[PDB]
Design an enzyme around this catalytic site. Sequence first.
Site, PDB file in Angstrom:
ATOM      1  N   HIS A 136       0.823  -1.213   0.000  1.00 41.03           N
ATOM      2  CA  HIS A 136       0.000   0.000   0.000  1.00 41.03           C
ATOM      3  C   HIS A 136       0.859   1.266   0.000  1.00 41.03           C
ATOM      4  O   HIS A 136       0.464   2.275  -0.562  1.00 41.03           O
ATOM      5  CB  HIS A 136      -0.914  -0.013   1.224  1.00 41.03           C
ATOM      6  N   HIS A 178       5.781   6.982   6.537  1.00 40.09           N
ATOM      7  CA  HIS A 178       5.430   6.593   5.187  1.00 40.09           C
ATOM      8  C   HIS A 178       4.835   7.799   4.485  1.00 40.09           C
ATOM      9  O   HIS A 178       4.595   8.845   5.100  1.00 40.09           O
ATOM     10  CB  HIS A 178       4.442   5.426   5.168  1.00 40.09           C
ATOM     11  N   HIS A 235       1.954   9.142   1.199  1.00 44.70           N
ATOM     12  CA  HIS A 235       0.873   8.912   0.237  1.00 44.70           C
ATOM     13  C   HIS A 235       1.185   9.845  -0.935  1.00 44.70           C
ATOM     14  O   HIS A 235       1.667  10.963  -0.699  1.00 44.70           O
ATOM     15  CB  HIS A 235      -0.488   9.267   0.840  1.00 44.70           C
ATOM     16  N   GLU A 268      -3.551  13.404   1.424  1.00 48.29           N
ATOM     17  CA  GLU A 268      -4.782  12.937   2.047  1.00 48.29           C
ATOM     18  C   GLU A 268      -5.539  14.124   2.643  1.00 48.29           C
ATOM     19  O   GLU A 268      -6.668  14.434   2.237  1.00 48.29           O
ATOM     20  CB  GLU A 268      -4.406  11.845   3.040  1.00 48.29           C
ATOM     21  N   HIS A 315       3.601  10.974   6.655  1.00 50.60           N
ATOM     22  CA  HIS A 315       2.982  10.666   7.947  1.00 50.60           C
ATOM     23  C   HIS A 315       4.030  10.052   8.879  1.00 50.60           C
ATOM     24  O   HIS A 315       4.528   8.972   8.579  1.00 50.60           O
ATOM     25  CB  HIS A 315       1.846   9.682   7.759  1.00 50.60           C
ATOM     26  N   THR A 317      -5.686   6.373   8.313  1.00 52.70           N
ATOM     27  CA  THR A 317      -6.268   6.612   6.999  1.00 52.70           C
ATOM     28  C   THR A 317      -6.243   5.361   6.128  1.00 52.70           C
ATOM     29  O   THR A 317      -6.684   5.397   4.986  1.00 52.70           O
ATOM     30  CB  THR A 317      -5.628   7.780   6.252  1.00 52.70           C
ATOM     31  N   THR A 318      -5.731   4.255   6.664  1.00 55.26           N
ATOM     32  CA  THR A 318      -5.795   2.962   6.027  1.00 55.26           C
ATOM     33  C   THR A 318      -6.509   1.995   6.956  1.00 55.26           C
ATOM     34  O   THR A 318      -6.467   2.162   8.185  1.00 55.26           O
ATOM     35  CB  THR A 318      -4.412   2.413   5.719  1.00 55.26           C
TER      36      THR A 318
HETATM   37 ZN   LIG Z   1      -0.590   7.580   6.180  1.00 60.15          ZN
END
Ligand SMILES: [Zn+2]
EC number: 4.2.1.1
Length: 258
Positions: free
Chosen positions: A62, A92, A94, A104, A117, A196-197
Amino acid sequence: HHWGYGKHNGPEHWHKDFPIAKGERQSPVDIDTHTAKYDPSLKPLSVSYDQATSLRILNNGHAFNVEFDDSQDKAVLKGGPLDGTYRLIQFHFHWGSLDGQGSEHTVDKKKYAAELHLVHWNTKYGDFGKAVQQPDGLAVLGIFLKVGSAKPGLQKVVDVLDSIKTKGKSADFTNFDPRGLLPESLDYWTYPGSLTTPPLLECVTWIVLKEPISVSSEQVLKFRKLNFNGEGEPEELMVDNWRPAQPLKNRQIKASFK
Ligand SMILES: [Zn+2]
């Protein structure tokens, strides 16, 4: 048929396996900067990364996570809206298929090319695993990326990505200094929300920095060469691994500044 970011398994589907997806404190949100109240009682944020010790980098299918040895008191976030101390475990990103999307959180609907993040757990809960069972288990520092000048301190991350192209690949990744990913100002917005996942647990105090960092087009292009698929499966580029803004539901956003 596990969760992902595609048409048949993406964010609009997550609620079936994870009903909290339609909860009261879901992340990310659009930050209406005009409605965030300056909270002069917010204390200075303290981001103390000088003893941080990275261990490994992992493509989890992901994103990619840079994981830290969090067995000692070494890389801590405190102050601001937080009570107590929170310890860094991983960071990590996005990002998008194009520079015009990828973040996000959004700022008055503006999307950034990417979002970093840095994930910290509340030390009063002993470790990450038990912290995610608590409504104040996590504090996540969110930092926006825009495309411009290169960020020199990001380059060590970019250069290891070719060794973790596909889901499940990991590499040793020691001595990475996350101070090289931080913008000048620690001005921020803060609100209560979630991972958020999946599993989308509502354990996060979000702290989103106003000042983006700049990365080069070449740096983000290398993120977009990663794969969602495992080795020996059809190649699906790891791009647009962002969840869109969720309903605020009468939560409030506070600001650390005027
Ligand atoms: Zn994140």
